Design a protein around this nucleic acid. Sequence first.
RNA 1: GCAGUCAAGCGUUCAUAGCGACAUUGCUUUUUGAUUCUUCGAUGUCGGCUCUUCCUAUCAUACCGAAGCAGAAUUCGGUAAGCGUUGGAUUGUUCACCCACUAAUAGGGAACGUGAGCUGGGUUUAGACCGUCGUGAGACAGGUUAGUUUUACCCUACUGAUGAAUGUUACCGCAAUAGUAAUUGAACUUAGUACGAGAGGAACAGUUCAUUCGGAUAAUUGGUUUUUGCGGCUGUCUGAUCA
Lengths: 386, 62, 224, 136
Amino acid sequence: SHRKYEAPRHGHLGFLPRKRAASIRARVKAFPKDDRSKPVALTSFLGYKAGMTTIVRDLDRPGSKFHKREVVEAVTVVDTPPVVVVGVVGYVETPRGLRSLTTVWAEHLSDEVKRRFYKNWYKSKKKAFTKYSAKYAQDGAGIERELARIKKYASVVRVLVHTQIRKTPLAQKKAHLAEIQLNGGSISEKVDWAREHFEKTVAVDSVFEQNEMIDAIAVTKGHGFEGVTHRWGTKKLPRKTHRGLRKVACIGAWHPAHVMWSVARAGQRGYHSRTSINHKIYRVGKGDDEANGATSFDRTKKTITPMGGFVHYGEIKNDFIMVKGCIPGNRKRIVTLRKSLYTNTSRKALEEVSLKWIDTASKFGKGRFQTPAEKHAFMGTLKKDL
Amino acid sequence: MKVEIDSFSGAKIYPGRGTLFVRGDSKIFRFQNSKSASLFKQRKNPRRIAWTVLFRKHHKKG
Amino acid sequence: MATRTQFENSNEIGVFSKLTNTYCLVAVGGSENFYSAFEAELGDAIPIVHTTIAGTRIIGRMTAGNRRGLLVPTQTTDQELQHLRNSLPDSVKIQRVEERLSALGNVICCNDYVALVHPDIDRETEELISDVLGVEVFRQTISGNILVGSYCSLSNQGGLVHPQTSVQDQEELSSLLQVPLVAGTVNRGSSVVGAGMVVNDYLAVTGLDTTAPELSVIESIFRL
Amino acid sequence: SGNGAQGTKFRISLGLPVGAIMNCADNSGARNLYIIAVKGSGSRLNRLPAASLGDMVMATVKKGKPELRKKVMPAIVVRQAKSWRRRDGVFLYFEDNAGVIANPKGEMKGSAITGPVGKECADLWPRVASNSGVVV
RNA sequence: GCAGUCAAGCGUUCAUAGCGACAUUGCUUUUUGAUUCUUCGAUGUCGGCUCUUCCUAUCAUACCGAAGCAGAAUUCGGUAAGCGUUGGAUUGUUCACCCACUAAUAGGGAACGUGAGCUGGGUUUAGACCGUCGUGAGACAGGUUAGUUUUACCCUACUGAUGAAUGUUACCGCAAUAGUAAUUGAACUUAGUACGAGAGGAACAGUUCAUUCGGAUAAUUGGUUUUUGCGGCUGUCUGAUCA
């Protein structure tokens, strides 16, 4: 028998197996293709996701109905302390993949990447990178031997960086260590730049900029063990069913006498690696820059942190990337922003956007006021202080 | 960008927030939240609802 | 000259254009051949202004005006109003209208002397219309149609009305308006006559499918 | 949208599936309408073809003048009462459903349309804009 | 059921653009026969629902070839299943028929896929009614009505989830290999142009959107609401008030 109503599948076979991720930090599987012309810059960056807020901008798109006219959008604000470099690592291209030949770590690692290496920081003697940091007692001839071996070899050069979690209003205290490939020409220049930037800040005004398309790689919000209907979007069965309705009714045929992998089963939902491409930056905001949330039309001094703070996160007091639309992963996750892999000429991209109004009312109720000065102006004086 | 005042409560309604309602005689109604809307569908008089602006103008509050 | 023009496929230009004696209002969404019929025969006489009204692209049926004025609805943004205030001269009187009984294009059928409006619209609107346009506002319905801007085109020379219309009401409007009226159609017999075409002292733009027996009667009664 | 429509309608919410009985909103003598299918819809197993403001439905008439009954005609929705999102931010909705009877080309059967009319439709069907009273 | 060859004829004229008699050679195993080889110390038997996969003999879509291809539309064919193949009235229906949308509403397999998945409308137990036949008991692939559908805790499969051991432990990685995803339409514009006697009347690039699919999210909007969070209301009990 054939199907009798030849309808699409449910779900996607390319997103398989739907299991838990490797970590809460999602691997950047693919870095931008290098060109040996540009100055040395990074390819990706590590932020922590805060939460969303409403944006009013001016849609500017000829041929549309809303040309030169205001729209609202949702943006996610991802929080960014400046990320500090601690080491570099070169890869020799083999016929079995880019095998790492060496790694060089910097001199004075901070206590966060010193905390990454212990499951138990309190009991431990904190003795990671003592005997390695003894290699600076000389002029670094071992260390210069290592970097000369990278310059002699090592087709592609990735740089070990880490977040500064102590500036982030989380409660983690332990930074996330990661690699980011560089894009400069002449790999000697790459590893010279990385040598010059040991224990140095890297701020997002250098990597990212306004209007640019970025991708975002993160681990999905997790939801436990989930049955076959909300996991795969499958139909519920009619109400008259015995022994469970919310199921997949026919699993497979009689033959093949096994259950095919392609039928939908019940299991893990969430906590997957997801890459999401072509997200557009609307703000790159600086924490030392007061009045993040003002704009040329807004003109009243306020930051982007909503009244009462971001729900379940805290208060942005750092740099921040502020990107169009939803992003994978929930709040307080390590989110990896990436430069786009292809030059996009799409007229949705390459649009010079500039905001008009940033929402900063509370996200913890139906917020009615943007600034507490405006709440005090509207609501008047109270039973409290005066 | 306009900031339109509410119809029931007198609240200020920032863009992308709230709802709008069109009564069949083409009078346009604006609601800040689900509260003032779901009191408007109960046909409540705003002059006797204690937290609206229309009440606190009715009795010279403040 | 009755010039054949289409708004991207539409035989109705009166939905999309507003033709007065000192200014002309056009919608932005058309090719260069749509503006060819305007810029060829007008050229350097009146300002032609690209605008939208209240976020709509039907601006001939949302607004109403004469040589002396222009009336916009309430939902028009301040950018559109500022562009209309900047592009039009200081002789025109531009003012928002505070009513929710229709859009202004289908209420008002006016000219330099006498106005005709919707019957249900109120005195507080009528005072504002007679103040801004400087026009004595009268209240009449053509043959039962409560929308007189959709079913009557008016000019200072003559005017077109609804095809199924009694002769007695036409003679009453000839005694009142003091212009001659002839019941005719537009665009191969479409019953809507106000939105099928616009007119002023120099020009009468119609759709492409308006026939030559219709076109000859139009160019005779409007006397171009 | 569909064949005979001027303009592209940005997607709004679908609040009138097959079977819905809207209130005919003009002077054409029909007292109500009845959606039987939606012009431009899509094929998905066991899904109802639903309509919205601005769309063009195939409708019949269940009341009114008996000359209009028992014949399937085109009709066009002008009020929705299931709230959608305009791109300038606000969610709005009308008090009740509605529609106007028309030919396939979009030319209006009646003369004047009563009550408000969504500007999502007045931009899209010009003839409805001509016969409209209140827009938005 | 599908496909060839031959070729008399049809097709203004012309066997073969498309058709094709009279004959003749096959493929198929979704019909139905023929047989009865396994199963009668029982493989649960119709259909709908549900969901996955495969097959092309391709209805649509991609690129093309022929024409009795001027344009439009249509017909016949090639590579191709990648991707889609619908909403309803009646019937238990498979089948069918209309209404209507659509780009299109192509045809099939998988123990006539699928009942420890469902339903049980049908057929096929026991009650009853009628017509017919029979002397009667009863008989009707004749019609109508009411009629219990059991078990998974095993092994496998699949879906997720851990895990000993390779000196320990941690951190950053590489990649074999396995899967894969996007889809189609409409409007403006080209353009009332080309091609056309006229009637009619496109396409390529560009723009803006939309259908179906998919993956995510929660600012806003809607739902849920045992924050029993705040308010109110009933009946009764705390002597009343308060709670």
